[PDB]
Amino acid sequence: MLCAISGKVPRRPVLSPKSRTIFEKSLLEQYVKDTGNDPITNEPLSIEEIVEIAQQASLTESIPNLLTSLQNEWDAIMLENFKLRSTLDSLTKKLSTVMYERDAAKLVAAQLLMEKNEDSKDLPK
Amino acid sequence: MLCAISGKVPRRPVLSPKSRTIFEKSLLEQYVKDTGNDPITNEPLSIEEIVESAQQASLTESIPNLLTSLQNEWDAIMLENFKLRSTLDSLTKKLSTVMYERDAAKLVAAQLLMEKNEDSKDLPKS
Amino acid sequence: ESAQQASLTESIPNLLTSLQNEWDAIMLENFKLRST
Amino acid sequence: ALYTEYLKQRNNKKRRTPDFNDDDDTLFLEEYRRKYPRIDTSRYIPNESSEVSLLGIV
Amino acid sequence: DNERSNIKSGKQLKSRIRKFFASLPSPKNDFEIEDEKEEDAEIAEYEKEEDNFIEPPSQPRVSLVAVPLAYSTLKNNPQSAIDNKYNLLVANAINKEPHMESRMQHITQGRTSMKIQFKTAMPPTEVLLESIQSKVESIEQLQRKLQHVQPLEQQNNEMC
């Protein structure tokens, strides 16, 4: 039902043979033209590899309003794309703060093991 | 703009109705007189088959051209989302394993802080 | 069974100004054509 | 009706004006201006790359 | 000398060597006001070098044994990490939906963009315009020729 690139319902879907995934003909072609690969599995795939594989028409309702709808929908998608990218940068940013603490902690364990090693020597004496 | 047989700018373009391609009349005519065929696909074609209303047109510029433009906009932006969906699935996967190694390690920091102080508590008393 | 249109240098306008003009030009022509 | 009345339907005259220290409404309007300006600056890059070659070919 | 450089680069820092901050002694002072948090704060200030540098005698064999020991201490573990990752993902989608102080920073970020981008736009525009306003006139004065080449066409067809 959904092409695994954009999120649309595909109007001329095509399936990759390296990885079982129905893409849209337009979008998969652009990716292959960028780099000869599959977007999910990163396996070597070409345009000739693709095998070309429900249509229900939207009846909005009972035209000047439809102008402002398309305006709002582009206005919404622009922010729904923006919000999803600042979240990616801050999840990577907060991930980097964890890596510093992870490696900083395992340096603090080395000094704590020395204090234990020093203690085990004194206990034996 | 070009003739597919010669490669020149044809001064009398005639389009065939079997392999759709703009040929120069004087060139294609000789090709047909040689053998009744279309040069590209080798399908049968005669001279009468080759072809050189009231609604006035204007040049293709930046309604239909505007609609196909908005496809390019959205189809490109849809790939922009993949770059951030795919990269998110790597960061969250590295964060999950990072926070698990943090949660698995901090239990050992808590025990060494207990054991090293307990060894200091034990030894100093003796 | 290629054409090139050079998208203007000032190419917001595609949503607002360009699209508005297209449906103005379609509207006032056919109305004037019905008059003819 | 549009042709007879001689009135075109109004479009979104919003993105151009806006205002700083607004509210949750202008927080959206601001974030709109950024993404479209980045799309704009990317939309001017692929034009200038070809430049006048794409124009003179048409 | 090649071997010594291979030992120093790897043992410099795990986060710094792999991939991607402002100096803040007040943030370190505010965060404390618990001990492990202060240790990582000083570790971040040291590697980066209102900022004083000092620590440069602490950060390979001791780290390898430390990593091997912690690995020993650490299907069921895979599902508990996948469930927690979904919980944090829901918390990240909840913190983003509430926002859409903070609003002033975004507007100023745009003012940088508006400045940077529109200056680039105006340079790209005026560079294009200089080259393309001539070609526009060339292309647009040619379009007017179709509008007269058509209008004569009909009168001749009509008269024919």
Closest chain D residue to A79, measured at CA: D32
Tell me phi and psi for residue E133, to 5 degrees.
-65, -35
**Solving technique:** cryo-EM
H or E element: which one contains A23?
A: strand A21-24
Task: State the Cα–Cα distance between residues B8 and E141, nearest whole angstrom.
Answer: 27
Question: Is-contact D28 E100, C-beta < 8 A?
Answer: yes
Q: Do A99 and E18 touch (CB under 8 A)?
A: yes
Tell me phi and psi for residue A92, to 5 degrees.
-70, -35
How far the first Cα of chain D sits from its last, in Å, is 37
Resolution (A): 3.6
Say how far residue E73 (Cα) sits from the centre of its chain: 36
CB contacts, 8 Å: B63 with chain C: 22-23, 26
In chain A, count of helices (H) and strands (E)? 2, 3
Can you tell me which residue has the tokens 């977007």?
Answer: A39
CB contacts, 8 Å: E125 with chain C: 9-10
Tell me phi and psi for residue A14, to 5 degrees.
-135, 135
The residues, ordered by sequence, that sit 6+ positions from C32 with a Cβ below 8 Å of its Cβ are: D3
Closest CA to D47 of A77, A26, B62: B62
Give the one of E40, E58, E67 whose C-beta lies nearest to A100's C-beta: E40
- A67's tokens: 């102008």
Query: ∠ at Cα E142 (E137, E148), nearest 5°?
Result: 130
Looking from the CA of B72 toward its CB, the CA atoms found within 13 Å total 12
Closest chain B residue to C21, measured at CA: B63
Question: Is-contact B5 B28, C-beta < 8 A?
Answer: yes
Question: Is-contact D18 C27, C-beta < 8 A?
Answer: no
Integer-rounded Cα radius of gyration of chain E: 32
Q: Please provide the DSSP assignment of E8-21 as one string.
A: HHHTT-HHHHH---
Interface of D with A in 14-53 (CB under 8 A): 28, 31-32, 34-36
Interfacial residues of C (vs E; Cβ cutoff 8 Å): 6, 9-10
- D40's tokens: 């704009």
- B59's tokens: 């040049």
Question: Is-contact B15 B21, C-beta < 8 A?
Answer: yes
Interfacial residues of A (vs B; Cβ cutoff 8 Å): 5-8, 26-27, 30-31, 39, 77, 81, 84-85, 87-88, 91-92, 94-95, 98-99, 101-102, 105-106, 108-109, 112-113, 115-116, 119-120, 122-123
Closest CA to B23 of B45, B46, B52, B49: B52
H or E element: which one contains E139?
A: helix E102-159
CB contacts, 8 Å: E120 with chain D: 41, 44
CB contacts, 8 Å: C13 with chain E: none
Q: Do B66 and C11 touch (CB under 8 A)?
A: no
A42-49, long-range: CB within 8 Å, 24+ apart, which pairs?
A43/A18, A43/A19, A44/A18, A45/A16, A45/A17, A45/A18, A49/A16, A49/A17, A49/A18
Say how far residue B73 (Cα) sits from the centre of its chain: 13
Question: Is-contact B62 C17, C-beta < 8 A?
Answer: no
Task: State the Cα–Cα distance between residues E133 and C8, nearest whole angstrom.
Answer: 10
Chains that touch A (3 or more CB pairs under 8 A): B, C, D, E
Tell me phi and psi for residue A23, to 5 degrees.
-100, 180
Tell me phi and psi for residue E25, to 5 degrees.
-75, -25
Q: DSSP character for C15? A: T
Which residue numbers come right before each break in chain C (C to N over 2.5 Å)?
Answer: 1, 11
**Count of C-beta atoms within a 10 Å radius of residue D56:** 14
Task: State the Cα–Cα distance between residues E34 and E29, nearest whole angstrom.
Answer: 11
Give the one of D3, D36, D43 whose C-beta lies nearest to C27's C-beta: D3
Task: State the Cα–Cα distance between residues B1 and B90, nearest whole angstrom.
Answer: 50
Give the one of A63, A71, A83 whose C-beta lies nearest to D11's C-beta: A71
Task: State the Cα–Cα distance between residues B84 and B88, nearest whole angstrom.
Answer: 6
Amino acid letter, residue A5:
I
Burial class of residue D45, CB neighbours in 10 A (0-12, 13-18, 19+): exposed
> Residues B55, B57, B63, B65: is their CA dihedral positive or negative?
positive
CB contacts, 8 Å: B66 with chain C: 14, 18-19, 22
Chains that touch D (3 or more CB pairs under 8 A): A, C, E
Question: Is-contact B32 B45, C-beta < 8 A?
Answer: yes
Query: SS3 of E80, please?
Result: helix
Top residue of C4, C10, C14, C20 to mutate, by most chain D CBs within 10 Å, is C4
Tell me phi and psi for residue B41, to 5 degrees.
-90, -10
Question: Is-contact A24 B72, C-beta < 8 A?
Answer: no
In chain E, count of helices (H) and strands (E)? 7, 0
